[PDB]
Amino acid sequence: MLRISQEALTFDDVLLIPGYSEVLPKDVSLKTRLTRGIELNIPLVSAAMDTVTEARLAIAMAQEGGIGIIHKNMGIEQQAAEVRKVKKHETTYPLASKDEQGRLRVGAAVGTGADTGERVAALVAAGVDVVVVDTAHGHSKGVIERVRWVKQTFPDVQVIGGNIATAEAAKALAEAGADAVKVGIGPGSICTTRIVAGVGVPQISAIANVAAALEGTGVPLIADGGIRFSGDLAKAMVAGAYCVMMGSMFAGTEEAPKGALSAIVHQLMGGLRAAMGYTGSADIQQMRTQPQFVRITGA
Amino acid sequence: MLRISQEALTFDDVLLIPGYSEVLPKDVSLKTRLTRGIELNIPLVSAAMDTVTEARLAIAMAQEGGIGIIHKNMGIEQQAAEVRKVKKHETTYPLASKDEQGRLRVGAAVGTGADTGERVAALVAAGVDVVVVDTAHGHSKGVIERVRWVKQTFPDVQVIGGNIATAEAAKALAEAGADAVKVGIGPGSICTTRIVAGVGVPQISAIANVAAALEGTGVPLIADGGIRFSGDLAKAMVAGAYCVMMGSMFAGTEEAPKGALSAIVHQLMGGLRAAMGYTGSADIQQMRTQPQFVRITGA
Amino acid sequence: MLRISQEALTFDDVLLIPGYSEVLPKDVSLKTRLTRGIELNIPLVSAAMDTVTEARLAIAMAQEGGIGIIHKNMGIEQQAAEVRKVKKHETTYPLASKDEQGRLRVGAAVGTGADTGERVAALVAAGVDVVVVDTAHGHSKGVIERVRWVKQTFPDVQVIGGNIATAEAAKALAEAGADAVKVGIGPGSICTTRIVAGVGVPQISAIANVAAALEGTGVPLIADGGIRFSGDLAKAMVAGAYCVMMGSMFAGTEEAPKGALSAIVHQLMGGLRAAMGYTGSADIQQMRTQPQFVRITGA
Amino acid sequence: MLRISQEALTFDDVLLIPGYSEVLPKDVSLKTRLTRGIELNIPLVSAAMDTVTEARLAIAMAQEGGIGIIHKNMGIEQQAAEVRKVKKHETTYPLASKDEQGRLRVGAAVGTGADTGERVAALVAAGVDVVVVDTAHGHSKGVIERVRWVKQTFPDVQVIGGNIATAEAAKALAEAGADAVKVGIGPGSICTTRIVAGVGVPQISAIANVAAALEGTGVPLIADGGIRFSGDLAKAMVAGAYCVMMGSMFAGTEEAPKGALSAIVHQLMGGLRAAMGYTGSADIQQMRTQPQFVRITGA
Ligand SMILES: [Cl-]
Ligand SMILES: [Cl-]
Ligand SMILES: [Cl-]
Ligand SMILES: [Cl-]
């Protein structure tokens, strides 16, 4: 009698099935798309969290082949200054994420507040590569219509909308002109969205439903939340993510506002390379479309 | 070979799927029905437990937009006096639950003992709004026939019967003239009904089976038991409850026989509003009929 | 590809669904059959364990309306003496289990060793009511052929065979002339049969498969193992057991070789009566055939 | 939308169903095949781990009726010397595993490194019985083509390939000429393959898929990983393993590079014999093909 749409799976419900392989971890390609217009050399994004991404950590992420999204828990002028610091950082890093001018890539988050138009303007004038319209509920008037507005007003900036967890949301963001979507609503066990609101979609099913909805559109999806180990990251990719956002795991690093960020990155990319080796996936498109899961009981 | 009627789900088996939303938590309507004849401004009832609801806590609940049910672990004259204190409390509280005379609403519990007729009479003469015929097993001769008797003898009082957990019980209460039913048998893990008697129905399935049985009748159902966080409350509503009863969570408050009851109420209603925001539900009827669950493994 | 016969359920996988009731716990009948020829006033048997049942505890069990099975971890002459002590105990206990001569009922266990014929003879000459051919694996030549032999050689004694856990075993025991079968192989989580041999059948499915196989034969089944609380006992009955054997739970009692056995009995029968009240079962035959389970996730 | 091939089961998801038995633990036969050409008197292999198998432990294993695989975390000349020590050990042990010359059997592991050809040559010249081409991912060019090469270059040595976990891998190894395959990828909960790479197949399903793929070929499979108790071992056999590899459980023994290895062996074989007794399996071929599982919830 309950209105149950499906059974939904998280990282711990599934394992990657090994497949034939002739490719070594060190030899696979980790190149992917952050957005329609933006490629990354590794599928790794740092979160728009005030304990995680400002200019220093965003610089390190771009140098590694990923990208940082500058958080929006600060003033407009501070946020544009963080963006400028990244875009002016003078560049040893053959993998760096860079724009057509050879400047490091950066993103910046915006919300739905009264200040959003002015914020987007200052960030775009500062040379931002991507504006991330980023709330706890991306399938909402505030997010979608803001994504529509950025796309129509600043047509040479990339726009990401999130956070979403359903096929329907992905399409509503695609129709608004989103160049990528970010996936993750209540993705961890015992996070405050589940406890407080009773709301959430287990992340492996969320990513897969959104990947299926977006197939053939050219719109990438970013998996944000619920990743604890590098094996989770591999699972997110096989479920259809184009890259993965990490937040609190980077929060203790030198670069954040325990050690170098580099170590953490290399360990995360190490496990992913291992998982590509096990599944026989030579590049990210193979990893996203070919390996299969087994479902497990957790016994 | 076992006589298993179904697999049944509790709060932890399910999450609310976010849906399109243009409504903010602060803007949704929490208006609902306690019974056929009685509306509440918030879907919240305090339990007929001797550590929870007497006149002081019942007053606070009515002022908040809900209602208190005075417990029956006391004498008949004490219980009527508790009711009178509520009905005479002189009323800053625009949400108050009130009768057609502007007096705060109150309920009172009765059992099946030899004293029930006299108890119901004293409570009705004291101006009670609702009589709650309330045992550990509402699908029983003692409860149903007592509900029939109150309805036939005092036709201007509202009557609730409980506790039940099945479609069949809901109908048997509806046929007896019940103006609402209360749902909850063995609703928590490791509660004494499960340990001692082996008896229970997981609460999300219980509420849904009873909501389905009652559809189109105009008879509301109250979810009583197994709610630990405000997210559980939201889930109870989506499963079809019209409001939710809380007991031990209020037991430490100033008003009960750690802080003000108000804080607890506002936090509980806060999470519900958040969950209505996430699901795009502007009012309680939307919340009860439109949002969907995903089933989770608990991995 | 695995040879999986079914998914099998234990006590914690299921709950009793409340049903219509007009019967109070105190008013239900607990009368049942231990065997074809032997009735008990309560469905409770004490185990043939050297820490549980000798003459003193067997006497108390019979006085309560159940029966004790004297354990076989002792000499033949000691075991016959334990039986004689019970049969001569002079009988305040209106519920007592008694034979056609007014003597308390007793059972005694035998194994498969070289001494079995002589043991059965001494026990029968001592006036035993039931011989329990009792090993860790009742579906075996040693048990079945011993049951056949007792039935053919001492046709005026009742014979129970165990322990079994399948339809096929029940039938093989019925064909050998067994007057009842005892059910329970690897019935607890983390018991030594599961850890050491990897062998076991969850007890709710075991009881149901054996009850289904025995339907219409007049052969009762005794549920032995995995019962921790009185609610488990109720579940065993609904799954089709005619009575239930308890071992280590009685091991600390005065009567065993923390308090009086009586307290434990009354608490166990209290929960069962409560469960009969909840399900509307006036007697044991109703309890075994009418109430239904819901399956639960354990979330 | 997820690419889930199946639900897959580990040891804790299943129990052996007892079946009719007239055979005692002590009387069953534990004779089996390690490879096409090699029989063992017990289905037990010690792992190619640097804390487990060198000449002393390999000698003890062969004397017990099993076999040791000498680990490859050492130099080529050291490994051939370990093999020679086993082949020259002068032989009280009626169960010993021996070649056609009366010398104890031994195996040795090789990897995929540049040194493999020279390693295989030295080991074969030292009189090795079986070469185990042994990596973390046997379904790979490095393993399969190395198995092909050993078979084509040294046609009088037995070759095992591993580790694998799928029907497809088993066949690819069979086609390369493998005389047996070794099964086990991410077989334990929380092992580093699952945490780091997100990769694994629950071991009962792995063994069954590989056994089904290999049926009628004459190629045995060895279950390697995830066995904690002797009951797990029995389950591995019923799922279709011909024998079972143990590693860290032997790591504390006298013979390894807490007590005698013998005790551990006898306890492991004790539980297996018990499980054969329960299921009525007189020999290993009966155990692999006849007993059935029940699936359990872990409640
Ligand atoms: Cl690898
Ligand atoms: Cl919200
Ligand atoms: Cl009751
Ligand atoms: Cl046995």
Numbering used by the authors:
A (entry chain A), B (entry chain A), C (entry chain A), D (entry chain A): 1 to 91, 205 to 370, 426 to 467
Please quote the paper that reports this structure.
Inosine 5′-monophosphate dehydrogenase (IMPDH; EC 1.1.1.205) catalyzes the first committed reaction in de novo guanine-nucleotide biosynthesis. This enzyme converts inosine 5′-monophosphate (IMP) to xanthosine 5′-monophosphate (XMP), which can then be converted to guanosine 5′-monophosphate (GMP) by GMP synthetase. Guanine nucleotides are essential for signal transduction and DNA/RNA synthesis and IMPDH therefore plays a pivotal role in the growth and proliferation of both prokaryotic and eukaryotic cells. The enzyme mechanism is thought to start with a catalytic cysteine attacking the C2 position of IMP; an NAD+-dependent dehydro­genation then generates NADH and the covalent product intermediate E-XMP*.
Here, we report success in this endeavour and present the crystal structure of apo IMPDH from P. aeruginosa at 2.25 Å resolution. The structure is a homotetramer of subunits dominated by a (β/α)8-barrel fold, consistent with other known structures of IMPDH. Also in common with previous work, the cystathionine β-synthase domains, residues 92–204, are not present in the model owing to disorder. However, unlike the majority of available structures, clearly defined electron density exists for a loop that creates part of the active site. This loop, composed of residues 297–315, links α8 and β9 and carries the catalytic Cys304. Analysis of the Ramachandran plot revealed that 99.3% of the residues were in the allowed region, with only two outliers: Gly226 and Gln458. These two residues are located on flexible loops linking α8 to β9 and α13 to β12, respectively, and the associated electron density is relatively poor. Furthermore, PaIMPDH possesses a structural motif that indicates that this enzyme belongs to a group of IMPDHs that are susceptible to inhibitors developed to target CpIMPDH. In PaIMPDH these residues correspond to Gly19, Pro25, Thr306, Ala442, Gly445, Met393 and Glu417.
